[PDB]
Design a protein around this ligand. Structure first.
Ligand SMILES: Nc1nc2c(ncn2[C@@H]2O[C@H](COP(=O)(O)CP(=O)(O)OP(=O)(O)O)[C@@H](O)[C@H]2O)c(=O)[nH]1
Ligand SMILES: Nc1nc2c(ncn2[C@@H]2O[C@H](COP(=O)(O)OP(=O)(O)OP(=O)(O)O)[C@@H](O)[C@H]2O)c(=O)[nH]1
Lengths: 427, 50, 428, 427, 439, 189
C-alpha cells in the first residue's frame, strides 16, 4: 500500500544499500536465502513496503542495484545477502566513471540510464500504491554522483508527485580521498536541490568520530559506518512497516520538516549508541535517548548544530514508552535550547512513536534535524570548488566528455544560493 | 600460492553493540598461582570468620 | 574483464618486463612454464596454459634470445617475441626511420591481435628507456602509431630516465630530447625512473653495496604491480586507470608523475620494525626515497596518489594524510585543496625468492605529480645544449634520414614543457 | 531518600572500598555482576542508598574510584567484584604519587581533582536527596593522604551542609613500611580536622593484633583487615538501609558523639568477633556483645582506651533483641567504668538497634568511640615528625613540588593543638 | 603502561646487559630470537612484557635497550651469539677504537663521534614508548668507555629528558682486586657525573661478589658470568614491581622518595639475600625472617665495606614471591630490636617495604637455587664513605707524582679537572660524614 | 554462537579440520561463512577470557609465518542456519624447554594455542570430542604436546580425562606433561 523502490548507485551507495538490506532482513526476519524465518505476525503485516513476493515463501527485496563497474556488483552478489536480490535487478556497466561526473552523467551513465529505468519502472508499476523512491550514493564520486543525479531527474520527470528520498554521503576535507570530488559534489547538489523531496546528508568524518568517541571502536571499518547509516534508514521508514502510537510516514516527515521547497537537507542520528563497556551500566530511557539524539556529537554530519538554528526536528522513537514522557522531553529540549531553534516556528519537533523496537534493542530513537548548520558543508565544498576553478585545475577531463565550462559556473552560482537561503533564517 | 581474501574488512562491530540483550557480563577466573590470582585471593579476598 | 596490454621495447624495457612478468607469475601462482584475477595480465588458453598479454620487441635479438632460451621459454607466445636483425646502436634515427620501419608493421599486427582478443581492454603499458636508441626512436614510432590507431585507450608508459651523473652512453641527451616530443603528446601518464635513484635506494634502505640491474628491475616491477593491483585484487577504495589519470593529471601536458615504494627495507631490519601505516606514509615523502634524482621539497606537489596494499585500515590512512598535510615541508599547490587520491587493496605485495625485499604486512606506492621533476629536464637541457653547441654526433643522426630541424624542435618542445611546469607551479 | 556517595583514594582506599562493596552486596543480595538476587524484600526496599539502577534489575554502586596509578584501577576491575562499578567512575592519572603528599596535593593529584569533582558532582545531583559522602584512604601514602584531603576540602566547599565521613588508616610505628609516612600523616591531619564531620581512625597494628589474638588468624593478610574495616562500615550505616526499633543515621551519631567541633576522631569496633575454635563455646548475647565492644582489645585503633576517659560512645546494635537488656548493659558499662568516662557528661553512650543482622550472624553491634586516647596515635606521629624534621630528613622531595617548611611547621603545630585539645578533658 | 629504557655502556655494561636481558627473556617467556611462543600471553599480561620489550607487526618483541661500546668486540660477539636476532640491529652501536681505558678518550675524543648516534637511537626508543618510567644505565667506574662515555651521555640525557629517573648500576673498584692500573683516575673523574646527573646510583664491587660466590654458592673459581647473573637478579628484583602486580608495590618514584634523604645522598648499597647453592637450600627453611636477617650481615653486601662502622639511613626491602606483610613486620621488628644494626636518630622509620607476587626466576645453568621467596635489600648507609676514602687515597697516591696525567691531558682534558673531581669527592665524603652525626 | 549459513554443504563433519590450505581455499569472498565463524569464535573467546585483543582470527591464521590448523564444532539448526559450539586452534612449533632438575631441552613440540567452548554450550562432554578428533587426525598423544598457559579448567579437564596432572611450567609460559622421554638434552643439567 506504501511500497518503496530502493536504488543504490556507486560503490558507496551499493555497500550502504547492502548493509541496509541486511539490517532490514534482520528486522523482518528474512532468511538470507530469501525465506521468512520470523517469529511474529507483525513482520509480515507490512513486508510489502520493501520486499516483493516470490511465491514459495521467498521475499525478494524491491531494490535496483546499479554501478558502472561490475566489481562492486560482484562483491555485492558474493556477500552474505548476495542471493537476496533478483538477478535481473543487477544493472552493471563495463567500466567505472573514474570519479568523473561528466563520464557518469553524459555518456557512460547516459547509455545505461535506459536499462536502469527499464527495471525501475518494472518495480514501480508492480506495486499496489507506490509511496516513493530512495537513493543511496556518494556525492564525491563520479558514478554515484553523476548517475544518481541523472536518474533522479529521469525519475522525477516520470513520477512528479511521488516522494524522492536520497541518502547521499557528503565529502569532507578531513577524510578526503579524491582529488576532484568537490567538482562532483558541486555538480550533484544542483540536481539534488531541484529534484528531491528529502536529502539526508551523511558525512564519513562524523561517522568516524561517532565510532571513535561514542562506540569507542578501536579500528572502525566501512561495515560499521554502513551499519550506522542502515540503522538510520530503518528508523526513518519504521512507521510504514510497524504500528505505532503516533505514526509518521515519509510524506508526513516532509510536510512537518521542510518550511520551503528547497530546504530538504537533514542531519540524521541514532539514540541508543552505547559503548561495549557502558552497555550494562547505562539506563536506556526516553530522556537519555532524547539528549543523545539532540547531542551534537551524535549527528552523522560534520557540521555542528550549535553553529546554527534548527528549522525543524523529527525524532522517531521505537518501542513501548509513554507519550507524556516523550512530550515533556521535547518541551524540555525546546525550552533549554531555545537559542538553537527558530522563533518564527512555534513548535519544531515532530515526534513519532513506534511500538516495535529494533531487534535486540529495548527502545530506540532516530533523529532527523533540519538545521542551518548544513550550510557549512556546502560552504566548504564551494570554497574548494572555487579554489580549483580559479585555475581550471582539472576541467579538461570534464570538457572531454562534452560538458562545457558554463555548466560549472551555473552549478556554483546555484549552489551558492542554497547556502544563502539557509543563512537567511539563521540569526 | 594464490591471492588471499581478507575477512577483517567485513567485520561489523556495531551489530553486536546495538544488541544490549546480547551482552554476556561473564568473566573467566584468574589463575590462582598467577600473581594476579594471589592478589585477588589475599588483598581482595578474605577468610570467613562467622 | 579488465585487460591491459604491456609492451617492452629495448634492452632496458625488455629486462624490466622480465622482472615484471616474474612478479606477476609469482602473484597469481602461475608457474614459469605457464601452468597453474589473472585475466588482467594473462590470457587463458583452452588447454590450460596462461599466456601473458605482452609484446616483447627489440631490434637486437640478444636479450629476446636470452628469454627464448631461459626459464620463461614456455611462458610468452612465440610470435609475441619480436626481434630485428641489428640494434639501433643508441641512435634515435636508426630506431625511428631506418630500422624501426622494418618491424613496426609486425609489432602493430601483434598489438592489434592482442587487443582484439580482449573485450575489456583498459590501456597500454609501454616499458622502455629514454637513453637508448631502440627504446627511444622505436618507442616513439610505435606509440605514435598506437595513439593514431586506438586513441581513447590509456597509454601508461614507464621510462628509464637518464641519471644526472651516472650514464652508460655518450649520446643519451640527444635521444632523450628527441623522445621528449613523443612522450608528451601521445602518452597519457609517463612514469620516468632514474637508475641512480634506485642505486641510492638499494645502498641506503636495503644496505646493498653493489646492486645490479636485477634489483632495479625488481623494484620497478613492484611499482607496476602496485599500480595495477586495483584491477585484479579486490579491496576497499579501488582505483581504476581512468580514475588514476583523472585524479592525478590536472592538465593535458602535466602527466609526468614520480614513483616510490616506501616499505623497502632489509630483511633483517624488517622483523624489528613496526612498519605501521603512518610510518610508511611518512617515508613515502622522504626526498631520498623517490626513484628520480630530484628533490620534491624544492617543487610543489599538485596531485598525490597513494595505493596502499595489505593490512591497511582507512582510518589509519586518514590520520596519516592529516599528519602529512600538517607538515610545512610537504608543500602543495594552492589550487588543489584535496591533493590526495587514496587507494587501498587487500593483497599484500609478494616477495620474490632471492630478492632484496622482505615480507612486509602492508605496502604503499606513492605516485606524485609534482613540479620538482623539472630539475631533471633542466639537467638534460644543459647536457643537450653543451652537446649541440658543437654538434658532436649530429651527423650520425642526419645520415639516417633525420633532419637537422628535429633537434631544434625537440629542444623547443622540452623547453615549453619546462615553462609549463614553471608557470603551473605558481600559486593563484 | 538518603543517598550516600562513596569515594576511594589510593591503593589502601581502593582495596577497602572493594571489600566494603563486596560486604554491602552480600547484605543487599546483589550479584557480583550487578544483578539483584536477594531473597528478601527488605534488602531492595532502600537499595538506593548505596546503589543506582540500570533498569534491567541491575544496580551500580554510587562509588567513585580514584587513584593516580592505573595499576590499582586494573587490579580493582579484575577483582571478584570488579565489574560491579561503572567504568566512567574510574578516574586515574598517569603514575602514582610516589608516597609524596606534595605531589598528590599540588600537581599530580591536583590535575585530576577536577575530573574527580566532575564525576562526584554528576553522581551527587543524580540522587533524590543526598545525605553525604564517605571516603576510604590511607594517611601514610601520597595519593590517598594528599589528594583525598584535597578532594575533601573541595567537597566541603561545595557541600558545606552534607555529612562527611572518612575512614582513614593512620600509620603506626610497629608495622610501619614507608619511610616518609609521618610527613604525609601530619599534613593530612590538618585537613581531616578542618573539613570532616566524623573521622573513624583505623590502625594497621590494631587490626593485626585483633586478627592475631581475637580471631586467632595464623596468616592475616590485607583481606582480613579490609573485611573487619568493611564490617565496621556496614555496621555504622545499617539504620539508613533497614528498619529498627531505634534508628540512628550518620547525622544522629555525629550529633551524639561530637561535643565540640574538632573532637570528631572516633574508634571503630565490632561485637561478634570470635575465633573459629570458640564459635560454639560462647553465647552471642547482648551482655557479651557489649563487653567485647567496650573491651580494649577489640578496638580497631592502636591507642589504649584504658589511659583515657571516653567523651562519648555509640554502640549500633543489629538483629532482634530486647531494649531492656541493651539499656541495662549500657548503664552497667557507665557505672562499673566510671573512671573511664567523663563526669561532666551525664550520659556518654548512644544506642541504635536495627532489626537486620549481617548475613550469618544472629546479632551484631558496631562500636564507635570518641575517647581521649586518640591523642596517643597523634603523639607518636608528632614524635616521628619532629625527629625527621629536626634535620629535614626527606624535605627536598616535598619542596620540589612547591611545598614549604612553614607549611610543615604549621601542620605540626595544629596537630599538637588537636592533641592538647583532647588532653584538656583528661584528668 | 609502565616501561623503562635500559642503556649498557662499555664492556662491563654490555656483558652485564647480556645476563640482564637473558633473565628478562626468561621471566617474560620470550625466546632468544625475539619470538613469544605463548600465544595467550600476548593477550593476557600485556603490561608485564611491555615494560622491557616492545612489539612489532610480525609478533616479535624488541628490547628497549641501547648497548653502546667504543670498540666492537663484545657487541660483535653479541651479533654472532645466541641473542643476535633479539636486539634491534640499530640499537647496538659501535665505534672502531676503544677508549683504551682512558676517561678523556671515552669522553671527548672517541665519545663525541658517536654520542649523536647514541642519542638519536635513545630518542627513537623514547618516542615509541608512551609511559617512560626512567632509565637504567649500566657501566663501570674503572673503565675508559664506561666512565668517559657514560659521563658524556648522562649530562645529555639530563638536559634532554630531565624529570625521568636515571638509575645507574656501576661496578665500583674493589679495594684490592683491580684489573686496571689507572682506574682510580677514571673513577674519580666519573664521580662528578654519577653525583649530579644521576638519581640513584648503585655501587657494586667485584671482590664482594667473589666472596659472596665463594661463601654461599660454594664456588672457589668464579668468573664474570656469575657476577653478571647476580646483578641481573638485583635489577630484575628492583623492576619487578613495574611489570608484576602484588601487595604493597614500590615503583621508581616511591623508591627514590623513600631511599634518598638528601639530593647528594643517593648512593645505596645492594644485596640479594637468598643467594645459596642447590645443595644447601634443602637444609634451610628459607623463611622471611632468615632471608631478612641475611640482608644485614656484612658478608652479604655486594660492596666491600663494613656496614657496622656506619649507620643505615633508609632501607628498601623489595620482597618477592610467597610473602605476607605480617612476617615482614615481624622481620623489621626483630631488626630494630638488634643493637648492632644502628640506624640514624632522625629516621624513626627507615624501612620501605615492597612485596611482589612473582617469585624469582631461576636461569638454567646458574648457581642460584630455586627459592619460594626472595628479597633485595637496598640500603642508604654511611659505610660507603670508607670505600670512597680508599679510592680517594689510591687516587692521591697516583696523582702525587703525576703518574699518568699526560695520557689524560693529551686528549682534551685539562689538568685541573683531576683536582676538581678530587675536591668533589672530598665534598661528598664530608657530606656523608656530616649526615650521620647525631642531633 | 549462531551462524546464518548451512555449513553442512561445505563442511563434511561436525568437527572439521581446517588447516591453512583449507582456509586459503575457503576464502571469505565466496565462503564467508567459515571465516566469519572462525572470527566470531575467536572474538567470543577473547571476550570471555578478558583479553584486550583477539588471538584467533582467520586473517591472522592464513598470513602466519608457520602452518596452523583449526577445529570448529557446529550443528545443524535449519535450512540456512547453523550453531557454533567450540574452537580449537593448534600448530607445530619449536620450543626451548626446561624439565625438572634444570635440564635444558630444545625439541619440536605440538602446541595447543587455543581451545574454547561457548559458555552457554559448555559441559555435556564438549571439547573432549574435538580434542580426541585432533589426536586421531594427526596421531599425536598428550605426552608429546604442549599447553599454552593451561587454564585452571584445562588443568582439570586434562586431569579428569588423561589423569595427567602436576604439570611443569616452562619459562615460555608453556606447561608440559612430566613425560620428557624425548631425550637428547642440548645442555647438561
Ligand atoms: N560510508 C561509506 N563511504 C564509502 C564506502 N565506500 C566508499 N566510500 C566513500 O565514498 C567516497 C567515494 O565514493 P565512491 O567510491 O562510491 C565513487 P563512485 O563509485 O560513486 O564512482 P566511481 O568511482 O566513478 O565508480 C569516498 O569518500 C569513499 O571513502 C562505504 O562502504 N561506506
Ligand atoms: N661484573 C663485571 N665486571 C666487568 C665485566 N667486564 C669488565 N668488568 C670490570 O669493568 C672494569 C672496567 O673495565 P671495562 O668495563 O672493560 O672498561 P670499558 O668500559 O669497556 O672501557 P674501555 O676500556 O675503554 O673499553 C674492570 O675493572 C672490570 O673488572 C663483566 O663482564 N662483568
Amino acid at each position: 500500500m506504501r511500497e518503496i523502490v530502493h536504488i543504490q548507485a556507486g560503490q558507496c551507495g551499493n555497500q550502504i544499500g547492502s548493509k541496509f538490506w541486511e539490517v532490514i532482513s534482520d528486522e523482518h526476519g528474512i532468511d538470507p536465502s530469501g525465506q521468512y524465518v520470523g517469529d511474529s505476525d507483525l513482520q509480515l503485516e507490512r513486508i510489502n513496503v520493501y520486499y516483493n513476493e516470490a511465491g514459495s515463501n521467498k521475499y525478494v527485496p524491491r531494490a535496483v542495484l546499479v554501478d558502472l563497474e561490475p566489481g562492486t556488483m560482484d562483491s555485492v552478489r558474493s556477500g552474505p545477502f548476495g542471493q537476496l536480490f533478483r538477478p535481473d535487478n543487477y544493472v552493471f556497466g563495463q567500466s567505472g566513471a573514474g570519479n568523473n561526473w561528466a563520464k557518469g552523467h553524459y555518456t557512460e551513465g547516459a547509455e545505461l540510464v535506459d536499462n536502469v529505468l527499464d527495471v525501475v519502472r518494472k518495480e514501480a508499476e508492480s506495486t499496489d500504491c507506490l509511496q516513493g523512491f530512495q537513493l543511496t550514493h556518494s556525492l564525491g564520486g563520479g558514478t554515484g554522483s553523476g548517475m544518481g543525479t541523472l536518474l533522479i531527474s529521469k525519475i522525477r520527470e516520470e513520477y512528479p508527485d511521488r516522494i524522492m528520498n536520497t541518502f547521499s554521503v557528503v565529502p569532507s576535507p578531513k577524510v578526503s580521498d579524491t582529488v576532484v570530488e568537490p567538482y562532483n559534489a558541486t555538480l550533484s547538489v544542483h540536481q539534488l536541490v531541484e529534484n528531491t523531496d528529502s536529502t539526508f546528508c551523511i558525512d564519513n568524518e562524523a561517522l568516524y568520530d561517532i565510532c571513535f568517541r561514542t562506540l569507542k571502536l578501536t579500528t572502525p571499518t566501512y561495515g560499521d559506518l554502513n551499519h550506522l547509516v542502515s540503522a538510520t534508514m530503518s528508523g526513518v521508514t519504521t512507521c510504514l512497516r510497524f504500528p505505532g502510537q503516533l505514526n509518521a510516514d515519509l510524506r508526513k516527515l516532509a510536510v512537518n520538516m521542510v518550511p520551503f521547497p528547497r530546504l530538504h537537507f537533514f542531519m540524521p542520528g541514532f539514540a541508543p549508541l552505547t559503548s561495549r563497556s557502558n552497555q550494562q551500566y547505562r539506563a536506556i530511557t526516553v530522556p537519555e535517548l532524547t539528549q543523545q539524539c539532540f547531542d551534537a556529537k551524535n549527528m552523522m554530519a560534520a557540521c555542528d548544530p550549535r553553529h546554527g538554528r534548527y528549522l525543524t526536528a523529527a525524532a522517531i522513537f521505537r518501542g513501548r514508552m509513554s507519550m507524556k514522557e516523550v512530550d515533556e522531553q521535547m518541551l524540555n529540549i525546546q525550552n533549554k535550547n531555545s537559542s538553537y531553534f527558530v522563533d518564527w516556528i512555534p513548535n519544531n519537533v515532530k515526534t513519532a512513536v513506534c511500538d516495535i523496537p529494533p531487534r535486540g534493542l529495548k527502545m530506540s530513537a532516530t533523529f532527523i534535524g533540519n538545521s542551518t548548520a548544513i550550510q557549512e558543508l556546502f560552504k566548504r565544498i564551494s570554497e574548494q570548488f572555487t579554489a580549483m576553478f580559479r585555475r581550471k585545475a582539472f576541467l579538461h577531463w570534464y570538457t572531454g566528455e562534452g560538458m562545457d565550462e558554463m555548466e560549472f559556473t551555473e552549478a556554483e552560482s546555484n549552489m551558492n544560493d542554497l547556502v544563502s537561503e539557509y543563512q537567511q533564517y539563521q540569526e | 600460492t594464490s591471492p588471499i581474501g581478507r575477512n577483517r574488512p567485513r567485520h561489523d562491530s556495531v551489530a553486536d553493540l546495538m544488541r544490549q540483550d546480547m551482552l554476556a557480563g561473564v568473566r573467566a577466573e584468574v589463575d590462582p598461582n598467577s600473581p594476579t590470582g594471589l592478589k585477588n585471593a589475599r588483598d581482595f579476598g578474605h577468610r570467613r570468620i562467622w | 574483464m579488465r585487460e591491459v596490454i604491456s609492451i617492452h621495447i629495448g634492452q632496458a624495457g625488455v629486462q624490466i618486463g622480465n622482472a615484471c612478468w616474474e612478479l606477476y607469475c609469482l602473484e597469481h601462482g602461475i608457474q614459469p612454464d605457464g601452468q597453474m584475477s589473472f585475466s588482467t595480465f594473462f590470457s587463458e588458453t583452452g588447454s590450460g596454459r596462461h599466456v601473458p598479454r605482452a609484446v616483447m620487441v627489440d631490434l637486437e635479438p640478444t636479450v629476446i634470445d636470452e628469454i627464448r632460451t631461459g626459464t620463461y621459454r614456455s611462458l610468452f607466445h612465440p610470435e609475441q617475441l619480436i626481434t630485428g636483425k641489428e640494434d639501433a646502436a643508441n641512435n634515435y634515427a636508426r630506431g625511428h626511420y631506418t630500422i624501426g620501419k622494418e618491424i613496426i608493421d609486425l609489432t602493430l599486427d601483434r598489438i592489434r591481435r592482442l587487443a582484439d582478443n580482449c573485450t575489456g581492454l583498459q590501456g597500454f603499458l609501454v616499458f622502455h628507456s629514454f637513453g637508448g636508441g631502440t627504446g627511444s626512436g622505436f618507442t616513439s614510432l610505435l606509440m605514435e602509431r598506437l595513439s593514431v590507431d586506438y586513441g581513447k585507450k590509456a597509454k601508461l608508459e614507464f621510462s628509464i630516465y637518464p641519471a644526472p651523473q651516472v650514464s652508460t652512453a655518450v649520446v643519451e641527451p640527444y635521444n632523450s630530447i628527441l623522445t621528449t616530443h613523443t612522450t608528451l603528446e601521445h602518452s597519457d601518464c609517463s612514469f620516468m625512473v632514474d637508475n641512480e635513484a634506485i642505486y641510492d635506494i638499494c645502498r641506503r634502505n636495503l644496505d646493498i653495496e653493489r646492486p645490479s640491474y636485477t634489483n632495479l628491475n625488481r623494484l620497478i616491477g613492484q611499482i607496476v604491480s602496485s599500480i595495477t593491483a586495483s584491477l585484479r585484487f579486490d579491496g576497499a577504495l579501488n582505483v581504476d586507470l581512468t580514475e588514476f589519470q583523472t585524479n592525478l593529471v590536472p592538465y593535458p601536458r602535466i602527466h609526468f608523475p614520480l614513483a616510490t615504494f616506501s616499505p623497502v627495507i632489509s630483511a633483517e631490519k624488517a622483523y624489528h620494525e613496526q612498519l605501521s601505516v603512518a610510518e610508511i606514509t611518512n617515508m613515502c615523502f622522504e626526498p631520498h626515497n623517490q626513484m628520480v634524482k630530484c628533490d620534491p621539497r624544492h617543487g610543489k606537489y599538485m596531485a598525490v596518489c597513494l595505493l596502499f596494499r595489505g593490512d591497511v585500515v582507512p582510518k589509519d590512512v586518514n590520520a596519516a594524510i592529516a599528519t602529512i598535510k600538517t607538515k610545512r615541508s610537504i608543500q602543495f599547490v594552492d589550487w588543489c585543496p584535496t591533493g590526495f587520491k587514496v587507494g587501498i587493496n587487500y593483497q599484500p605485495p609478494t616477495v620474490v625468492p632471492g630478492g632484496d625485499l622482505a615480507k612486509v604486512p602492508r605496502a604503499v606506492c606513492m605516485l606524485s605529480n609534482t613540479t620538482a621533476i623539472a630539475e631533471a629536464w633542466a639537467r638534460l637541457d644543459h647536457k643537450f645544449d653543451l652537446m649541440y653547441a658543437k654538434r658532436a654526433f649530429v651527423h650520425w643522426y642526419v645520415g639516417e634520414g633525420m633532419e637537422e630541424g628535429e633537434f631544434s624542435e625537440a629542444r623547443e618542445d622540452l623547453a615549453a614543457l619546462e615553462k609549463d611546469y614553471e608557470e603551473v607551479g605558481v600559486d593563484s
